[PDB]
Amino acid sequence: GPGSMENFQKVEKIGEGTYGVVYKARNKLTGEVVALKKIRLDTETEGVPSTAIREISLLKELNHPNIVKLLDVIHTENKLYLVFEFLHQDLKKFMDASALTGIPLPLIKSYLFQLLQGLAFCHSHRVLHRDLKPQNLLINTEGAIKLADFGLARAFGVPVRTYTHEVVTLWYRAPEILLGCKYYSTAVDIWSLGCIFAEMVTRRALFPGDSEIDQLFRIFRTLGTPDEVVWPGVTSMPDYKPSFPKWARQDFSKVVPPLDEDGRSLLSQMLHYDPNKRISAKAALAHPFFQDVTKPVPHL
Amino acid sequence: GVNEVPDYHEDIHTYLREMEVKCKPKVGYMKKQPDITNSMRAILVDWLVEVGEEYKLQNETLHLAVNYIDRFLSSMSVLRGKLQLVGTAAMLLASKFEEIYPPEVAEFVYITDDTYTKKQVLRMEHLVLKVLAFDLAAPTINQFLTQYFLHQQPANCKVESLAMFLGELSLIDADPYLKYLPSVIAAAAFHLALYTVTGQSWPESLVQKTGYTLETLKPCLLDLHQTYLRAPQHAQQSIREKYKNSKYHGVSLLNPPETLNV
Ligand SMILES: COc1cc(Br)ccc1CC(=O)O
Ligand SMILES: COc1cc(Br)ccc1CC(=O)O
Ligand SMILES: COc1cc(Br)ccc1CC(=O)O
Ligand SMILES: COc1cc(Br)ccc1CC(=O)O
Ligand SMILES: COc1cc(Br)ccc1CC(=O)O
Numbered sequence: 051g052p053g054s055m056e057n058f059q060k061v062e063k064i065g066e067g068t069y070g071v072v073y074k075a076r077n078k079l080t081g082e083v084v085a086l087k088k089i090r091l092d093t094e095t096e097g098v099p100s101t102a103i104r105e106i107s108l109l110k111e112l113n114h115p116n117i118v119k120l121l122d123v124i125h126t127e128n129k130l131y132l133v134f135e136f137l138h139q140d141l142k143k144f145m146d147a148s149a150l151t152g153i154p155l156p157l158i159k160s161y162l163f164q165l166l167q168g169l170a171f172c173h174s175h176r177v178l179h180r181d182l183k184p185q186n187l188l189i190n191t192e193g194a195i196k197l198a199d200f201g202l203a204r205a206f207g208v209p210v211r212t213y214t215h216e217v218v219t220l221w222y223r224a225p226e227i228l229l230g231c232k233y234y235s236t237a238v239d240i241w242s243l244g245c246i247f248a249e250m251v252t253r254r255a256l257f258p259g260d261s262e263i264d265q266l267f268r269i270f271r272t273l274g275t276p277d278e279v280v281w282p283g284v285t286s287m288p289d290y291k292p293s294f295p296k297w298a299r300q301d302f303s304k305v306v307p308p309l310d311e312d313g314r315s316l317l318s319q320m321l322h323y324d325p326n327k328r329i330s331a332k333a334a335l336a337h338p339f340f341q342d343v344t345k346p347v348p349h350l
Numbered sequence: 351g352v353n354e355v356p357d358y359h360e361d362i363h364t365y366l367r368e369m370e371v372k373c374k375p376k377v378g379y380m381k382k383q384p385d386i387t388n389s390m391r392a393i394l395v396d397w398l399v400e401v402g403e404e405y406k407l408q409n410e411t412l413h414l415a416v417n418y419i420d421r422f423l424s425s426m427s428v429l430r431g432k433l434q435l436v437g438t439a440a441m442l443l444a445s446k447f448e449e450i451y452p453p454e455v456a457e458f459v460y461i462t463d464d465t466y467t468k469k470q471v472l473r474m475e476h477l478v479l480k481v482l483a484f485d486l487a488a489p490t491i492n493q494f495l496t497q498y499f500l501h502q503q504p505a506n507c508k509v510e511s512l513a514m515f516l517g518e519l520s521l522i523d524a525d526p527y528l529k530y531l532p533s534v535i536a537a538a539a540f541h542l543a544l545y546t547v548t549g550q551s552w553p554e555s556l557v558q559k560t561g562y563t564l565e566t567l568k569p570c571l572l573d574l575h576q577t578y579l580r581a582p583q584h585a586q587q588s589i590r591e592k593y594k595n596s597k598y599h600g601v602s603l604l605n606p607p608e609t610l611n612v
């Protein structure tokens with residue numbers, strides 16, 4: 051931990067999680083701009099938090115240009131400091147700054163391609179992210195986007211065992227979690243990225259539920275209510291109810307009208323009901339949507 | 351399907367093979383430990399088996415804890431009166447890593463018979479984190495085993511439980527299992543379990559994935575076979591008691607085969 055707080059100069063607060071605050075800071079010796087995350091300890095009198103033990107252990111092993119970089123960890127008895135690489139903004143703030151402009155298609159395609167790269171790298175290292183949403187995706191001035199906030203990530207085994215159910219921000223949560231399935235897998239991160247893809251195009255969340263059942267219902271009203279044909283096992287799932295309204299699948303060109311045929315193909319495969327048929331990040335990298343992909347800087 | 355991550359299982363297996371080498375403890379740490387022995391470590395691990403069954407922890411948690419303990423003792427000299435505190439902090443950390451619902455610190459202090467304070471457990475937690483440099487996502491025997499299980503045709507729960515049981519036995523005796531990688535003990539456990547239950551052998555499909563043959567597994571196989579034969583007599587018995595439970599198909603009641611033909 052070559053880090054030592056003395057060499058950092060605070061700049062401004064940039065964020066706050068449950069387990070502390072993040073500050074933009076500047077390394078007085080190298081010039082490097084960093085994000086310092088302070089984790090407050092024994093604020094629950096239970097020692098180092100499980101979230102922090104998981105974030106540090108997994109982010110130390112994950113070195114990918116599209117994954118946020120943990121540069122160091124400062125371990126004090128009363129405080130844990132996580133030293134991250136600094137990025138200027140998250141995708142939520144950019145989409146909101148891109149209100150009436152739109153995000154240009156080359157930038158959407160670049161961002162989705164990089165997201166899938168970072169995600170594939172996670173899955174190849176047996177890490178599920180389990181909280182992909184625009185707020186947790188960081189962008190820089192050079193046109194990079196990176197998965198961040200590994201506070202809910204988890205190292206999985208093959209095959210997966212039952213893990214925490216209370217996972218993924220609601221708007222981005224996969225149907226199999228909503229239906230209380232015993233097991234979920236890498237497919238839940240793809241679902242999230244699918245929602246994000248749509249949201250980059252429209253600048254509005256694809257399924258903004260205000261409850262678990264409303265979330266499902268909104269999904270069903272867009273993609274159709276799943277049956278045994280589209281999704282074998284669905285009617286047996288713990289929180290499946292026969293009484294569920296049976297909505298017709300709407301033609302996918304209506305779900306995100308401005309999207310071209312390739313984009314719609316890719317999106318459909320990210321939001322496939324059956325987690326077994328849902329495209330993987332690895333396979334998605336090869337989808338024709340990306341044939342002409344480049345990496346332009348953000349426009350703002 | 352996706353629960354067995356078809357598009358990632360190979361990448362993951364390869365990555366675990368690399369990591370198990372970086373997470374490997376020193377094979378000869380007990381000689382450099384002035385005041386603790388293989389026998390004391392056996393007592394500790396056997397205890398941890400009982401702690402896990404009382405709190406209904408995953409087996410993966412048990413394996414992680416043992417990894418943490420062995421790595422810790424590989425660089426940190428420990429008095430016998432403190433071996434339990436190390437073990438408790440290990441089990442706490444493993445729980446926080448791996449369990450949906452870890453036991454509280456208080457529950458960990460309780461299981462020590464007030465031998466140690468809450469303050470001591472949390473301070474050891476910090477120490478173990480420092481010594482391991484937060485490198486907690488260690489490959490275990492179990493992580494290898496569950497992949498190997500996908501090569502059974504058909505799946506047999508007696509095979510699966512028996513392999514888990516044998517792998518766990520190996521946690522107890524630093525000598526001789528500190529000299530074998532998790533992936534290799536898992537391989538030996540899997541072949542021994544398969545042979546015992548169905549008479550079949552380490553399959554060619556697993557030769558294709560691991561590069562391990564009965565030839566490369568033979569040394570560990572001979573050790574594990576002896577451990578299986580001698581298990582009723584071993585001073586530590588918590589794993590056998592545990593594997594009587596129907597949760598585990600009562601596999602500890604199966605008779606070891608007398609010979610391997612290997
Ligand atoms: C939150 O405050 C800081 C942030 C950084 Br980076 C360094 C030092 C301080 C102490 C202070 O001046 O409060
Ligand atoms: C809230 O304070 C900080 C936050 C960060 Br990030 C870095 C350093 C400090 C000073 C301190 O440890 O108080
Ligand atoms: C608000 O949090 C951050 C912001 C920036 Br910029 C870098 C890293 C983090 C920590 C994290 O990704 O958990
Ligand atoms: C040898 O002392 C112990 C070792 C272990 Br492991 C468990 C319990 C004891 C007695 C005690 O902690 O009161
Ligand atoms: C708390 O100590 C660390 C934490 C991290 Br992350 C890296 C390195 C150390 C010291 C060491 O490498 O022993």
Ligand SMILES: COc1cc(Br)ccc1CC(=O)O
Pocket residue numbers: 363364367368559560561
């Ligand atoms: C025997 O070679 C390999 C086989 C597999 Br699968 C993974 C890694 C290696 C390198 C090694 O572990 O020596």
